[PDB]
Design a binder for this molecule. Structure first.
Ligand SMILES: NC(=O)C1=CN([C@@H]2O[C@H](COP(=O)(O)OP(=O)(O)OC[C@H]3O[C@@H](n4cnc5c(N)ncnc54)[C@H](OP(=O)(O)O)[C@@H]3O)[C@@H](O)[C@H]2O)C=CC1
Ligand code: SF4
Ligand code: SF4
Ligand SMILES: [Zn+2]
Lengths: 48, 114, 96, 111, 126, 23, 303, 383, 208, 95, 176
């Protein structure tokens, strides 16, 4: 979560490889985030 | 029951207008079957045009025949223009029915159908 | 914001609006989310010992439409309404 | 004045005498209307009142804001339209009694 | 004007576009609907409903729904008298069965006879 | 109490005039 | 039969007909038209494909919502084929490429493919297996194609005895092989009788054979109503294609120079009951793509 | 003879147009419309009031709250309910927001339909913030129902009006920059001045409404003549056009955007903290706490969502100043829980009726400019 | 009665009563019902021999301008002999008033076709012809607007069902779109929502 | 946690498993029958039977406007515990 | 109150006519429009990177509805058919049976996501808050079979998260 950039570039995610054995280094989807960070990342809160 | 007419006074003008419209539909088919690039000979098209005119043969009221003349003249104008496509002119025919029979016995083998 | 001075000056010079103060990127005056929970007031109902529904029966006040004229030395010739006044130019810069 | 607000309505040049000859033609064609109809009474009443407003005006803007109808040439178009319906209502005989009634179980709504 | 003089039935069935199968195959039941017997209210009376017969409603083999080959089945035509119902049913072409309107019988009930002396109308529980 | 959303004593002005520099 | 196998109501588009058809091949020409008529019937069509999902995507919107189903298979493993015919009312065998490959030949496609599927459909316990074969498939020579189909007919007659071997002539249609092969040329002049038959009459015959028993076991043959000469056929198709002009293997040219003959020892269309159509109507249908803008019906009808 | 072109449904909205043109300068054009026909009136006839409210939300689709406001005021006019004042002020604020949205989409899609590409992107960033406001208010991106007959449902959350204030300032600067970009742009003035003149007599006989009446002379605002709500307490003025030009009509739309900014400013400054919905449980549903700990509130919730509220028998026609014009709804209701027949007067339909007089003496690029210059969405034109 | 009840005005009610009486006085030939509702909008219920005289009177006559035309519809009512009700909805410009001229007709009668005195009624009349089925005589063009060309049945009637009789799908036999009888995938469950107990006593019709 | 028929396919909480004579076993080929493996009957028989010292007691559902509407239930039978229709969780009395 | 525009005459003063001529010849305002486009050239782009920064939303967002269940308990639904009664698309299909315990329950609760217009009327009509329009936009389905949610896809979707749905409801249960 960065604070200096504008509203839309507050919070980003960096995905890692080998979460279900799908070779997710390339072709990264959505939907890989657990739901508490799905509340946090869509800017519905102010607390992690 | 002094009813206002549409066009006519009795069945005489009704017969005159429907034979005028049939003459127009007769001279209107081969132009369209050359234009829209159909797959059906001219004689079959004329036979189904006269079948569509023989379908409503038991109609007697003059206002109703006047209104059918109006319907046919509207559709003949929409077919002499290029507004209607190949789909609607083939939709007048019936090639994709696999038609249900009319005997009681084959209506009995596929039942619940009076 | 958070840009250097030279491109800021060229933005201000290529369009003379002093563009830095209003630029439509929202940074700090986004409304702070997870506000405190609200208590919502109740208006002119719920007051005990006057709320007979026969009083404010707005559905049943709808009368059937009245009629007259049917099938079954006189200053007259009325209009449906008084005639509508010609307007006037507003004062907030009439010819923009 | 010059170039009023309406687009296809080019300006007039003599309001007073044009509107007066319009209303003399109104009273003429209305003089050809039968008498016992109410239509002659109401039209002749409102047209004599409007013409009598017109008879004693030296100005233009005073006639515009005093006589209702608003803008000055819309009054002239309105007068031409009323002359057109006077010519049409010489025909059509609307003061005759009612044409044949409905089946009378019809205009009740709630079905 | 009024030039046409004829006293004949109307034949709109060739104009209304519905095919001959659904003209001469189905049938119209014309009836006052019965009072919904769990409730007690005859506001559901006073309207002659025209309805059609029901037909096959099989099971949609992917979910378990009620598929149907019936356009006309979900109609209802609320009328106000039997005569206009018969006139519309004969005009628009299809067959019709007109059922009967069965009013509640005007009885005579009396609390004083619920508390009688020698009769057998002795409720013995109130 | 009440927790609606009124403004805080009235907001500021918002310009509504066509602004051109005619330079 | 369990419930949800009884029919219900009218035909097609979530109108449940009573057959579940496992249709082998089905990605090419004839299988696509047969899936078209089964989706018009309102059935459940299990198509197995070994190719890309794009071709079964092109034949996909035929059936209704979830009526047809897709599954993978191969020509090597019996387990995927038994998984394809786990539960099926009927199964039809429509397979065979008109040219060789490096992995599958004319040899053993028509011997190793129908034996394996007929074995696993007999062991899975289905009825009404319909196998198509080409006409004049004989042990007599001049085509590896035709001798392999003759061995295939004998083997599918030997194992699974209650099968319906059915055989069409050189069928022609909107996306034909041989008539389009005639139009796409540049040629010789000889004499050979040959009778095309139109594809929708053939697939109406197939659906009547697949839902109309008393035809189980007996082999059928499709005979077009024309039975005429090849040379006037080529000149008629050029005259209707408005061009004068006076994978191309040797097996294909010997097929179109094989004299197709018919024997009435097996019944045709009338004992099954569907009308056949002549050439010229559907020929004017398929012969588009003349020229930029560009009737003379020949109708040779020999013998 | 003459060239009978058939402009199909490709993009130059979506229509079919058969033009018997003379020689790059036309003769007889006929719009075949009805390609986007859905059956809204029959569907509303077979449904209830609250359930068929989204049909009135989406029969017009660019305006998204004025159509809701028109249908909800039809039902509130027939049912004899005055909504509470805070509902009226939020309804006015969102009417002005939707008016701003529809005018700015009409401006940008007319610019792109001519061919200018970039202010489309600028003002659609602004309209992305507009949709952020709609998301925070209701939860939907575009098709917020949100306007029940019986006032605004489920009032705005805490912390919104400051964002609307910030958006007001920045949007005033952005529309000033749009007038900086275009508007005395020379080639665009050459593109549209003398095309599509409309006489006010023909503007009344052909039944033009809204912006066409402003452009062709006569002063006619529903918001000024017939205040259907609290518009009589906010002070604004309407722009009038001198000549019947397309450039004039563009100027009129831009100044209606600017007056929408004024009304939003005064509506923020004069918000009363009254109440969300009406003081009648038989029309609006009761709130959920009273529903749970109350018997009569549960009964009214249950019947009000199954059967719905009934409507007394009668017929009404109301019409409000949507950004396209006099958006009209004519309800006919038998006394029941379903409406008997509704019908919709579409300003786009009435404007497209006069396409012959707007494109009689001009060329076909001017025909595309005339089709663009009236905010016609081809879903509302269908009814 | 003060909160949450729509306050009615009586000045507009008295004026519309007086004006409806005035209209029915000056046009005695064609006028049957003159009704003012509770929310003050005028309705004049009309025999179908005077559509052109009533609208030529009402567009002109200088005491009621009524320049603008809105909704035209002919609400499809069964139970009557004359089914359809054509509703011309006239809006003035100088006056701020709304009147509804409601003329009646049955299925097979030409009304006098107001296209010559309201040019806005061109597509309105063509749309009512296509959707309802009311023919309009002495009229330039009647075609099918808002419907398919191969479609017919006049679908906005109460007699035409909700789902139509035809349904289109693409097929590969004839390589085109064809029309087939409707085979829905779900029933369209019709709900019996019209509960009893007479929610309005003021609208009770007298019984037999 | 879940039962399974001898055809090899999982039953649900509703006993709707297919027979040997269906084709929906073939529509499940290659794609899993996504059954909820968490039954709703057995997560209440594990709940403690509450014992409340009054006679007629309330039930909310754990939170104002988070839960079912209030039901007041009676606990006067001696062999059958009272049971909320909304909740499903029992109560008893103590005196 | 009307404020009408397009009223100027060409001023025959020499400065106004020579300024209009200089505008016509020296290309003034076209270079001014170029200056405005350069002023937006030298800005920062107002784009967001999608697969790493999902865009902002609201705590009342509507989409991907699923069934809730009680805190440490059974299913929350009753099969009271309020949502089937209010569903304007008529997408809900409920068939109810009671189980062996005696509480009234279901057998079939099928929603067509294809028919669903996503109003919120089934969110707000449910008295016990069983069905709630969820947070997200994750459908993107290759087949038309899979967009028809059964009761068990709904319960797996309500068990894939409750913490999100409980957090949104606990954020916004005092408005509705
Ligand atoms: N002239 C004609 O058209 C006539 C044809 N027939 C018969 O009709 C059938 C179909 O012919 P047609 O459609 O024209 O041509 P195709 O070759 O295109 O049809 C055969 C089908 O089976 C598939 N297939 C073929 N070989 C294999 C293999 N080794 N492994 C897997 N799949 C295979 C094909 O491709 P894919 O693998 O991509 O699915 C296709 O789906 C044939 O059996 C032929 O004998 C009979 C009489 C006349
Ligand atoms: S409204 Fe709620 S409790 Fe009622 S059936 Fe629907 S989901 Fe179940
Ligand atoms: S949100 Fe979807 S499921 Fe819920 S009521 Fe609306 S259409 Fe029905
Ligand atoms: Zn409980």
């Amino acid at each position: 979560e960065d604070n200096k950039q504008f509203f839309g570039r507050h919070r980003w995610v960096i995905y890692t490889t080998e979460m279900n054995g799908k070779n997710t280094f390339w072709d990264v989807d959505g939907s890989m985030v657990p739901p508490e960070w799905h509340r946090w990342l869509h800017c519905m809160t102010d607390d992690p | 029951t002094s009813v206002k007419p549409i066009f006519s006074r009795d069945m005489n003008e009704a017969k005159r207008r429907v034979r005028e419209l049939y003459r127009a539909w007769y001279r209107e088919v081969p132009n369209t079957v050359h234009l829209f690039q159909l797959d059906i000979s001219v004689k079959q098209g004329r036979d189904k045009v006269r079948e569509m005119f023989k379908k409503n043969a038991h109609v007697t009221d003059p206002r109703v025949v006047d209104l059918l003349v109006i319907k046919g003249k509207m559709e003949l104008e929409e077919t002499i223009n290029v507004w209607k496509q190949r789909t609607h002119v083939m939709r007048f025919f019936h090639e994709t029915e696999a038609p249900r029979p009319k005997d009681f016995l084959s209506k009995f083998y596929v039942g619940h159908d009076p | 914001a958070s840009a250097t001075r030279l491109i800021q000056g060229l933005r201000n010079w290529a369009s003379g609006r002093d563009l830095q103060a209003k630029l439509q990127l929202r940074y700090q005056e986004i409304s702070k989310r997870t506000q405190p929970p609200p208590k919502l007031p109740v208006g002119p109902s719920h007051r005990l010992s006057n709320n007979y529904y026969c009083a404010r029966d707005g559905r049943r006040e709808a009368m059937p439409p009245s009629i007259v004229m049917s099938s079954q030395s006189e200053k007259k010739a009325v209009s449906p309404a008084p005639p509508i006044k010609r307007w006037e130019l507003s004062q907030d810069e009439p010819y923009l | 004045k010059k170039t009023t607000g309406l687009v296809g309505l080019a300006v007039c040049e003599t309001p007073h005498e044009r509107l007066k000859i319009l209303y003399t033609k109104i009273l003429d064609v209305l003089g050809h209307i039968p008498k016992n109809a109410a239509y002659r009474k109401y039209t002749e009443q409102i047209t004599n009142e409007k013409l009598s407003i017109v008879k004693a005006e030296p100005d233009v803007k005073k006639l515009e804001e005093q006589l209702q109808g608003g803008q000055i040439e819309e009054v002239i178009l309105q007068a031409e339209n009323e002359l057109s319906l006077a010519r049409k209502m010489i025909q059509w005989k609307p003061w005759e009694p009612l044409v044949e009634e409905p089946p009378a179980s019809q205009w009740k709504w709630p079905i | 004007t009024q030039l046409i003089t004829v006293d004949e039935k109307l034949d709109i069935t060739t104009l209304t576009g519905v095919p001959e199968e659904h003209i001469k195959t189905r049938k119209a039941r014309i009836f006052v609907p019965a009072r919904n017997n769990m409730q007690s209210g005859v506001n559901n009376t006073k309207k002659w409903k025209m309805e059609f017969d029901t037909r096959e409603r099989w099971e949609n083999p992917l979910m378990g729904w009620a598929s149907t080959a019936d356009p006309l089945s979900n109609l209802v035509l609320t009328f106000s008298t039997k005569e206009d119902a018969i006139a519309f049913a004969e005009k628009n072409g299809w067959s019709y069965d007109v059922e009967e309107r069965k009013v509640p019988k005007p009885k005579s009930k009396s609390y004083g006879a619920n508390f009688s002396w020698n009769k057998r109308t002795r409720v013995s529980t109130k | 109490v009440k927790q609606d959303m009124p403004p805080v004593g009235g907001y500021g002005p918002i310009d509504y005039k066509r602004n051109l520099p005619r330079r | 039969l369990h419930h949800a196998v009884i029919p219900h109501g009218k035909g097609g588009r979530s109108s449940v007909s009573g057959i579940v058809a496992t249709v082998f091949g089905a990605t090419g020409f004839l299988g696509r038209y047969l899936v078209n008529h089964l989706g018009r019937m309102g059935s459940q069509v299990i198509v197995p494909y070994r190719c890309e999902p794009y071709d079964t995507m092109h034949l996909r919107p035929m059936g209704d919502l979830g009526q047809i189903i897709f599954m993978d298979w191969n020509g090597r493993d019996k387990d995927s084929i038994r998984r394809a015919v786990e539960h099926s009312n009927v199964v039809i065998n429509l397979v065979g490429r008109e040219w060789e490959t490096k992995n599958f030949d004319f040899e053993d496609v028509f011997v190793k493919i129908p034996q394996a599927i007929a074995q696993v459909s007999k062991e899975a316990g289905v009825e009404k297996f319909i196998h198509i074969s080409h006409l004049n498939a004989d042990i007599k020579s001049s085509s590896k194609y035709l001798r392999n189909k003759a061995v295939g007919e004998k083997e599918v007659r030997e194992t699974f005895p209650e099968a319906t071997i059915i055989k069409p002539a050189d069928i022609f249609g909107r996306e034909d092989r041989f008539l389009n092969y005639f139009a796409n040329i540049r040629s010789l002049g000889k004499k050979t009788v040959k009778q095309p038959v139109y594809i929708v009459d053939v697939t109406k015959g197939i659906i009547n054979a697949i839902k109309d028993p008393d035809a189980r076991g007996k082999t059928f043959a499709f005979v077009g109503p024309n039975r005429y000469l090849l040379f006037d056929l080529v000149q008629y198709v050029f005259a209707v294609a408005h061009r004068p002009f006076l994978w191309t293997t040797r097996d294909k040219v010997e097929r179109i120079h094989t004299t197709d003959r018919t024997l009435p020892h097996l019944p045709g269309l009338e004992d099954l009951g569907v009308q056949a159509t002549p050439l010229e109507l559907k020929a004017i249908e398929v012969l588009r793509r003349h020229r930029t803008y560009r009737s003379e019906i020949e109708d040779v009808q020999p013998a | 003879s003459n060239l009978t072109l058939n402009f199909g449904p490709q993009h130059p909205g979506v229509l079919r147009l058969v033009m018997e043109l003379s020689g790059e300068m036309v003769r007889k054009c006929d719009p075949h419309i009805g390609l986007l026909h859905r059956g809204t009136e029959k569907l509303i006839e077979y449904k209830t009031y609250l359930q068929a409210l989204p049909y009135f939300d989406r029969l017009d689709y660019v305006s998204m709250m004025c159509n809701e406001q028109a249908y909800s005021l039809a039902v509130e006019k027939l049912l004899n309910i005055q909504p509470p004042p805070r509902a009226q002020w939020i309804r006015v604020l969102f009417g002005e927001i939707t008016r701003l949205l529809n005018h700015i989409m009409a401006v940008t899609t007319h610019a792109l339909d001519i061919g200018a590409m970039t202010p489309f992107f600028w003002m659609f960033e602004e309209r992305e913030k507009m949709f952020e406001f709609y998301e925070r208010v209701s939860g939907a991106r575009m098709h917020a129902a949100y306007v029940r007959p019986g006032g605004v449902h489920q009032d705005l959350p805490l912390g919104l009006m400051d964002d609307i204030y910030e958006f007001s300032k920045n949007f005033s600067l952005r529309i000033d920059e749009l007038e900086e970009m275009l508007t005395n742009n020379r080639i665009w003035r050459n593109r549209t001045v003398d095309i599509g003149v409309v006489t006010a007599e023909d503007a009344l006989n052909y039944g033009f409404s809204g912006v066409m009446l402003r452009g062709s002379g006569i002063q006619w605002d529903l918001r000024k003549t017939q205040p259907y709500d609290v518009y009589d307490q906010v002070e604004f003025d309407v722009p009038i056009g001198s000549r019947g030009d397309c450039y004039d009509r563009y100027l009129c739309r831009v100044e209606e955007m600017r007056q929408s900014i004024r009304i939003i400013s005064q509506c923020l400054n004069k918000m009363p903290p009254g109440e969300i919905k009406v003081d009648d449980a038989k029309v609006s549903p009761p709130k959920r706490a009273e529903m749970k700990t109350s018997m009569e509130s549960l009964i009214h919730h249950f019947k009000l969502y199954t059967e719905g509220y009934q409507v007394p028998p009668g017929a009404t026609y109301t019409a409000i100043e949507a950004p396209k014009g006099e958006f009209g709804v004519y309800l006919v209701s038998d006394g029941s829980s379903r409406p008997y027949r509704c019908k919709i007067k579409a300003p786009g339909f009435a404007h497209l009726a006069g396409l012959d007089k707007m494109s009689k003496g001009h060329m076909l690029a001017d025909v595309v400019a005339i089709i663009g210059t009236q905010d016609i969405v081809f879903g509302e034109v269908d009814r | 009665t003060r909160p949450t009840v729509r306050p009615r005005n009586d000045v507009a009610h008295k004026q519309l009563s007086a004006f409806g009486e005035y209209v029915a006085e000056i046009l005695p030939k064609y006028v049957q019902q003159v009704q003012v509702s509770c929310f003050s909008e005028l309705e004049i219920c009309i025999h179908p021999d005077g559509v052109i005289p009533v609208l030529t009177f009402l567009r002109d006559h200088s005491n009621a301008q009524f320049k603008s035309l809105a909704d035209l519809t002919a609400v499809d009512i069964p139970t009557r002999q004359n089914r359809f009700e054509i509703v011309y909805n006239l809006l003035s410009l100088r006056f701020n008033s709304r009147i509804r001229v409601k003329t009646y007709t049955d299925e097979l009668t030409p009304v006098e076709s107001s296209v010559s005195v309201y040019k806005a009624a061109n597509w309105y009349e063509r749309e009512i012809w296509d959707m309802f089925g009311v023919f309009f005589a002495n009229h330039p063009d009647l075609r099918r607007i808002l419907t398919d060309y191969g479609f017919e049945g006049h679908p906005f009637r109460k007699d035409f069902p909700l789902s139509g009789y035809v349904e289109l799908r693409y097929d590969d036999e004839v390589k085109r779109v064809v029309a087939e009888p409707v085979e829905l995938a779900q029933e369209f469950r019709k709900f019996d929502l019209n509960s009893p107990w007479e929610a309005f006593p003021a609208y009770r019709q007298p019984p037999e | 946690g879940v039962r399974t028929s001898p055809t090899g396919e999982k039953v649900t909480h509703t006993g709707q498993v297919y027979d040997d004579e269906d084709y929906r076993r073939v529509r499940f080929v290659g794609r899993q029958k996504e059954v909820n493996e968490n039954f709703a009957i057995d997560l209440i028989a594990e709940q403690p039977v509450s014992q409340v010292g009054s006679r007629v007691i309330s039930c909310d559902g754990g939170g104002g406007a988070l839960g079912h509407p209030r039901v007041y239930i009676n606990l006067d039978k001696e062999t059958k515990t009272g049971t909320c229709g909304y909740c499903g969780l029992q109560f008893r009395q103590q005196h | 109150t009307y404020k009408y525009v397009n009223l100027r005459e060409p001023s025959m003063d020499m400065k106004s006519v020579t300024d209009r001529a200089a505008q016509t010849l020296l290309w003034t305002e076209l270079i001014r429009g170029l200056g405005m486009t350069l002023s937006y050239l030298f800005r920062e782009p107002a784009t967001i990177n999608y697969p790493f920064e999902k865009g902002p939303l609201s705590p009342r967002f509507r989409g991907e509805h699923a069934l809730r269940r009680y805190p440490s308990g059974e299913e929350r639904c009753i099969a009271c058919k309020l949502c089937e009664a209010v569903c304007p698309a008529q997408a809900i299909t409920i068939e109810a049976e009671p189980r062996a315990d005696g509480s009234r329950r279901t057998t079939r609760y099928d929603i067509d996501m294809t028919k669903c217009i996503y109003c919120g009327f089934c969110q707000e009509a449910c008295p016990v808050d069983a069905i709630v329009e969820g947070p997200n936009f994750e459908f993107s389905t290759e087949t038309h079979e899979e967009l028809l949610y059964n009761k068990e896809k709904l319960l797996n979707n309500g068990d894939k998260w409750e913490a999100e749905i409980a957090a949104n409801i606990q954020a916004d249960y005092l408005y509705r």
